[PDB]
Design an enzyme around this catalytic site. Sequence first.
Site, PDB file in Angstrom:
ATOM      1  N   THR A 147       0.755  -1.222  -0.181  1.00 47.17           N
ATOM      2  CA  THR A 147       0.177   0.020   0.445  1.00 47.17           C
ATOM      3  C   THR A 147       1.356   1.620   0.053  1.00 47.17           C
ATOM      4  O   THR A 147       2.037   1.040   0.151  1.00 47.17           O
ATOM      5  CB  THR A 147      -0.922  -0.693   0.800  1.00 47.17           C
ATOM      6  OG1 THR A 147       0.065   0.502   2.259  1.00 47.17           O
ATOM      7  CG2 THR A 147      -2.151  -1.618   0.906  1.00 47.17           C
ATOM      8  N   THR A 148       0.515   2.318  -0.360  1.00 47.67           N
ATOM      9  CA  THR A 148       1.345   3.217  -0.379  1.00 47.67           C
ATOM     10  C   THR A 148       0.980   4.193   1.362  1.00 47.67           C
ATOM     11  O   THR A 148       0.798   3.910   1.905  1.00 47.67           O
ATOM     12  CB  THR A 148       0.420   4.391  -0.558  1.00 47.67           C
ATOM     13  OG1 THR A 148       0.014   3.918  -2.787  1.00 47.67           O
ATOM     14  CG2 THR A 148       0.773   6.269  -1.752  1.00 47.67           C
TER      15      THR A 148
END
Lengths: 241, 243, 195, 231, 167, 235, 240, 250, 244
Positions: B30-31
């Site tokens: 994920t970011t």
Amino acid sequence: GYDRHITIFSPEGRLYQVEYAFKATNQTNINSLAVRGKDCTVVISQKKVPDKLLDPTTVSYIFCISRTIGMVVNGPIPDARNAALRAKAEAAEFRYKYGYDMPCDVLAKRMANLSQIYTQRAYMRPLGVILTFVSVDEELGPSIYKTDPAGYYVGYKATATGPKQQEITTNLENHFKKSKIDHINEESWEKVVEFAITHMIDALGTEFSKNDLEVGVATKDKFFTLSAENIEERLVAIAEQ
Amino acid sequence: TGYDLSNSVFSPDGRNFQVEYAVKAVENGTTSIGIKCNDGVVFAVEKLITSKLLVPQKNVKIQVVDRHIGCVYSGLIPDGRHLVNRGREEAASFKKLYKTPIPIPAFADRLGQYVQAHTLYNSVRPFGVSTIFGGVDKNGAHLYMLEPSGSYWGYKGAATGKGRQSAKAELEKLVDHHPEGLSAREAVKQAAKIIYLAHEDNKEKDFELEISWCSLSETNGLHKFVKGDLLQEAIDFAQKEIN
Amino acid sequence: MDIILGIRVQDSVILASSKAVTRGISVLKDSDDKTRQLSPHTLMSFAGEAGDTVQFAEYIQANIQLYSIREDYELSPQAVSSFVRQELAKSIRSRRPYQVNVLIGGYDKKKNKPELYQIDYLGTKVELPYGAHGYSGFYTFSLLDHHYRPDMTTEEGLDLLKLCVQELEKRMPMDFKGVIVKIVDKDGIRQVDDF
Amino acid sequence: NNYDGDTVTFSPTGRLFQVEYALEAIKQGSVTVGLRSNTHAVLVALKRNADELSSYQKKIIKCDEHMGLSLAGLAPDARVLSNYLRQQCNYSSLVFNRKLAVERAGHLLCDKAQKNTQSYGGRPYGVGLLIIGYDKSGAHLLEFQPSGNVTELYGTAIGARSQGAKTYLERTLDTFIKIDGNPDELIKAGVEAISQSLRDESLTVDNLSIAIVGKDTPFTIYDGEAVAKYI
Amino acid sequence: GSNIELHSLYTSREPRVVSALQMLKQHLFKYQGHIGAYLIVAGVDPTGSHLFSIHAHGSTDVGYYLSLGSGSLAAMAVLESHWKQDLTKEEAIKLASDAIQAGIWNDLGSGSNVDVCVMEIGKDAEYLRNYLTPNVREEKQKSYKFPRGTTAVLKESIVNICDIQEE
Amino acid sequence: DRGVSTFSPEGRLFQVEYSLEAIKLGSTAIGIATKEGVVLGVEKRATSPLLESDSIEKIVEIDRHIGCAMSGLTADARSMIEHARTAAVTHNLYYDEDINVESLTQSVCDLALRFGELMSRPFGVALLIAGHDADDGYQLFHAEPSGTFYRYNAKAIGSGSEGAQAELLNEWHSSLTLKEAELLVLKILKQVMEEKLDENNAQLSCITKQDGFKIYDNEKTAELIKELKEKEAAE
Amino acid sequence: GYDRALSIFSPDGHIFQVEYALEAVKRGTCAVGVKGKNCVVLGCERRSTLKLQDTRITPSKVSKIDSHVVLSFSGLNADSRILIEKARVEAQSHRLTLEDPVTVEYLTRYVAGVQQRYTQSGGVRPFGVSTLIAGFDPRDDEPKLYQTEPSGIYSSWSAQTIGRNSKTVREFLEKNYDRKEPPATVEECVKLTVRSLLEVVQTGAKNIEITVVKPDSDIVALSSEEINQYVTQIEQEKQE
Amino acid sequence: MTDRYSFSLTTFSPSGKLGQIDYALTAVKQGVTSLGIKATNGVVIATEKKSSSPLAMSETLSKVSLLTPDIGAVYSGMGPDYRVLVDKSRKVAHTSYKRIYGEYPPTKLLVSEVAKIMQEATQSGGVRPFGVSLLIAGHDEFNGFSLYQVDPSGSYFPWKATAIGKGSVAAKTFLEKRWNDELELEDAIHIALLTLKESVEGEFNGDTIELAIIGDENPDLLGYTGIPTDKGPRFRKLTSQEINDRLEAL
Amino acid sequence: GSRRYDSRTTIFSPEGRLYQVEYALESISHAGTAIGIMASDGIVLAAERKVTSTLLEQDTSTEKLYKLNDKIAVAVAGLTADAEILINTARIHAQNYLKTYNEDIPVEILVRRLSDIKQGYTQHGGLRPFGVSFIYAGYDDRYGYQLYTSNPSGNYTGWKAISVGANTSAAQTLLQMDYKDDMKVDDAIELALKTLSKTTDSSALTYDRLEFATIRKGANDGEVYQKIFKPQEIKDILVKTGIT
Ligand SMILES: [Cl-]
Ligand SMILES: [Mg+2]
């Protein structure tokens, strides 16, 4: 063909992992230069900040090992910092045990012996770095000693490291063939830095701004790095003659 | 060939392929982002809501080290927790001997040397995380990002994970449009926006926003989570900017 | 205290050892045998601290028996005595030294000669015509110095030993409840019932 | 393929195959359901027999008075991890006079699993765990994967055909969360959830295993004629 | 001395007094005074001339003049009376040997001869063994050489010191 | 080569699955649990007629209330029996009582997965652990090298297992007498054995609350074999 | 320390290192054991490929473990010494703690235990050795003969053979050895053992070693001439 | 972590060859030429200072190393492997001899110790052999002057004269013709310079040649006077000037 | 991890042989031939140095014949370095025995220990075996004069006469032919040299290519002398026996 994965001899009597470690050395695409004055030793290195999001002040490959010894590294930063921390530790331990500042050439020998072990012991890999140690030694005077992943080391009148080392090497060779002396015959370190930058400009054929260079100076009883503004003053003096 | 089967083996290029494979695990995650503001740092992360059965606000990702350092990471979550555990030991031993809380640059190299050590032997596996961390020390605010190779630098802004390219572009605008600098409250609002904008790379599943900050003025140089009204104000600002 | 005597005659070695085991003002036994057969032609008598004496003798017995099985050969008394001394010499500088004093009586089949060895808990070793450990040694030495002759027979040796025990009974203040006598010669190790 | 020989090797796409193979052992395991309200947290486990002469393998392990898990995969690995939780729960009680938080129990399982994924010679754990507990912040349900990933949930299911139960809970979320101060009704919802994962076989008296923990309820396991009420 | 020689070979430098000093004190400190070594350490090196003293617990001190041992108080009394700044070589030998004489004469633990070692900068150290001989025994009144056959001998025998012979 | 602790793509440990193959080659062992006791029977399978069969020990006492039959690489069982005996006695030393059959089984199974690069490989032998305790009465367990154990009303392991288990499936009821269980073990052993069953190539044993664990005499087993032959000839 | 798992299972549930160890035994010189009514005889083959050998000092094939128990072997000679040394140490250790010599069954169980341990221990290979262990229990007149192999399994035998061409001499013993009436005397038992080796040996010269163990630690090794008289009598009866 | 390479990396091949030792000897063959000659009244060891760069100060790199006051060493092969062997050789002379007997070891026993360290890198776990051959020249009171060769295997042999590395086969032939048992030290130095000139391509002077002798005691190099029995080291490295003087009478 | 690069030096082949032991024996078959002959009145050890040079200092050279104590010597065939590791271990065991029992170690006990060390390197540790075969010449007062051999397997046997290294097959046939039990040392010297002279791969057998040693009771009365022959002494015995 597992003789290419670990540090055992090939049928030709070669260590391929050592040879490949030397190649990792140029992964950063940075060129370093080291020269000696009467009273000082100067080391200059290219500084490249490709990302605008980077804090340029933290991007460095020059290390203050002890108060007297400086180290510039040619190779990836993880291995550079591994070598830096170890040299800092070894320099501190030496002073504690033997009661005097570790000489530049002795630290070079020690880090070279550690490198040799990684070429003989299988479980440890070589570090992909070339270490250039500089100081004004209290016995030998201005000193340049350089280590590599083979565990080789030697002294230098001057030296250059990185992709374009041969171009810088020949430029320095030609100067010392004229002057017929083993150093830069100059009083101030300011003018020895001006010589170092000038001869790198001539050798690489590139101009430098204050943010493009990174300078380390060794005098008697201290090694220090220049700020951007200290380099700017050096660049102004070169342009004005 | 075979140079990529064993960790710590140099390829004929002079590359460690096992480390480069670790980076793939990170790119899959994920970011997560970090923003360096006038007197501190802000951290934000994207949490993918896999199912409705996930309890909102419970599965916390951002981790504190000592009381002044925030840590967020993208990739194998367990590998990140392992690295933070070591960071907490290093920070504890430093404070025990030297009294002062570990400076950020000093803490950066402690993680740096530990991660680099997991590239020296084939008995271990490289870390499957890139770690964005920082906080406030005596010399001011510091933001760092650390890769599986052991490589780290200081940053004005940092991003990693699946939405890093999008995030980096938004960070680069803030650096240009604010040379004088960004305030801590502004950096929280901007952090929210950048995660929402970077969620376009993970648009299949809806997500939950999670922000933390260390500011000299706003949190007294301690690491705190953004909660309640200030979190909702940042979500509202973010939602307004995408529309 | 415990009496262990050794006399080496022309063709044998005789060991006399007190049969009483006492701890303080208590008599624990009156038929105790303070001897271990190390090999068919080697006998060891021991006196000292409770537990240590038997533990040391049985430990030495096991090692000498192991050597005999492994090489299908009997270690010479000189060799057995040296092994025993060295084990004691190790123990003095150990955490808890063995407080054991031993007499080693053996017949060397190669030289066809009987040998007597006296070793103390420190690992002090000497070869003697006659030997003893403890308070009893003071008396018996002076008596044996006068009477002992090197070309004595086994029967003559027993009579001299008989005299030593009789004189020890009168002169010693503690009751050692008699002795057990064992002879070591070419034919092996036997116990003299009548004494 | 070439990168599944050991746990110390990344694949060219950054995958750990030995971990993914361990994850497969769980899917082969028998189904177990977990769900909670604000007051109570329930485990429901379908036990598996070898044949008709054989017993039904126990699925639920008590870790403390306020915490326990259900297992799916290698039972011996559940025994090793549950023993470690028992010890950590026990250490917290003895040293700090403190019942171990469910969230912190998760963090400890994660870190124990991780070490087995980064070191040569060792192997990943071949089991998945559903941890229920009641602590100072109320009822909790956790899902453990031997990758090291631990997740806090209102409800979930692991093992063979678990997807059926997981969908049912995703619909019933708004109903079963509100079942406060009614243990029987929360178990009914758990038994109705696991029922969505059955095929051919149905819930019998020696087949079904239920556990509950809550506000004024220690962690207790129900087997035999004690679960006949819910069939 | 052994470790200093290995260090000298490793560094390619002449050894320094501060090194021998540091290595001695760290060793003695380790053994908490149980190694009862009390030393006066002097020498010339590339740094210059140095004079140190080392006590058995691992403590060191710097001075222009030092004395140690049972005769130190006799020796220090002479040094405190006759020492000045800027002594010549001849003066310093005279002062040093006089301070030892004070110990020999007035200390029961000291006696016989005076041994000196001079270490001058840019010169070879000269070791003057028995520099003074103030205590030479006088001729005895009688020769105690006995007539041969005086001692009663039980037995005589040749001792074989040679190895096992050939043929 | 490859790790000893390696998982297969199906999520099974290679070395464990391979050891289970070694056990299939082993001589047959049968256990039947009743309310009157638990019977344990084994095929001896002597490799030659010069081999003195009575020296073949595949039924072993762990404590007075726990018997054990083995099948597979039987040499591997010696250290497992040693651990079991030590556990049973150690528990009696610490708690002044008899250890539960399940607890003893659980203790043996904790050794199973202690292998890696601890011992170099899993055990190549399966155990039938039969016993009695006051809590759960007469019990029969099957201990595998996987570390898993199952309780069984009746169980067969070794070369003739899946044939024997199908026979036990039909024959076992909750009302079986001990005499009925003895004959039933002899019947199923005689069915799956290569050579003809007699008192020299097969061995019976039982565990009752009263008398504890007993290995039957050859003379006693011989009489039960003669009783079996007559009752099969009776219809 | 070297931890590598050398003895592991294969997909067909075989341990190849243990099975390859049995191949080392197959290569070894033949060894035979026969127990009579009141004795046990150990016969051993000496390959005559080695002459100019000093038979005084050359390691003998039968080794005393204690005064009442003997061990013969087939396989790697070097490996056998390590098992013999451990057995001899355990024999003295048992005497020291139990105050009684080992039973033949106990000494066998110990040696078999060592062989098993070297099949599931890291960094070690199994013993390339099978053993025949023979003797009489303390104060017992019942003969005892046991066999061990690299896997660690052991068992008691009326008569048994191991090593090269053991399949042949086992065939002989299976038809020639009656359980109801074993060799009544020492003569009969030695004769049957020499006969069994003559099926495989080649020349009945210095190729056959015979060791007779009787009750109460009575162990003697027959000489060349004594064995030669058995070899002579067997073939003179065969000429008919 | 932990060194999990507890096994040999040098094994026998079906042909009975130890591969890693053969490959080590191949590395030595690629190395620059070094030689040793033994005279009646001394020994000489010599090699070429192959400078990697002219900017490099070749004086700082020592190919000829003092091991004890009476023993010197030169090599052919991998320089780093030599440097760590010299360190271990200097230390073992002290730990295994001088700290026991109070005197420096005789040539043959120090050689024996260096040989042992190299044998162990040939059998010990997780290590490769050393990629060097050593020539060790020495004097001791009872054995007199001696010259030894040590190979990666750990094997060593005494020599009247020999050569190792690049042009060894040619050098050894040259030495066989010139060597007699009546050579003075100056004669052996002259022959050493003649032999070495054949294997050198570029500059041949005191700055490019490294030469040391084991000869008479040097009291001028002892560093102290006063002890008659201490007469100074027999090992002397020749200066740049001293080599150039003997190249005019060449 | 590290498993990838492990040769596994201590495993059986499918035929039940030890790979590394077999390959080590192949190595030893290329080494210079060593012969031991045992007579009634002593033992002879003769060995051939491998292709020497004219510039090798022979009088200070030792590669074949080594002293273990005053009563026991060994002839080496294989890696000299590997042999020296084992020789120093043997020298220490001999002095350990003497210190413990105050008697010189019997020959077999020393042989058995060195053989048991070799065995260990074949069963555990994962290291390569020692590439060495020894001929032990020794005297003790139990068995008198004794010849033994050991090989990398750790197996050892006793001999009246034996050869190790190159051309053993040929050497053993020649010894088996000319050897008698009533033979004397002077005769055994002649046999040993005549056997090497016929088996050698060299053009001729000279003094500069031999190491020679005798263990004689030819020591004044009841004792035993070891004689390691000097270059000039080997030259003399070559003329006496009529080979040069
Ligand atoms: Cl070093
Ligand atoms: Mg390596």
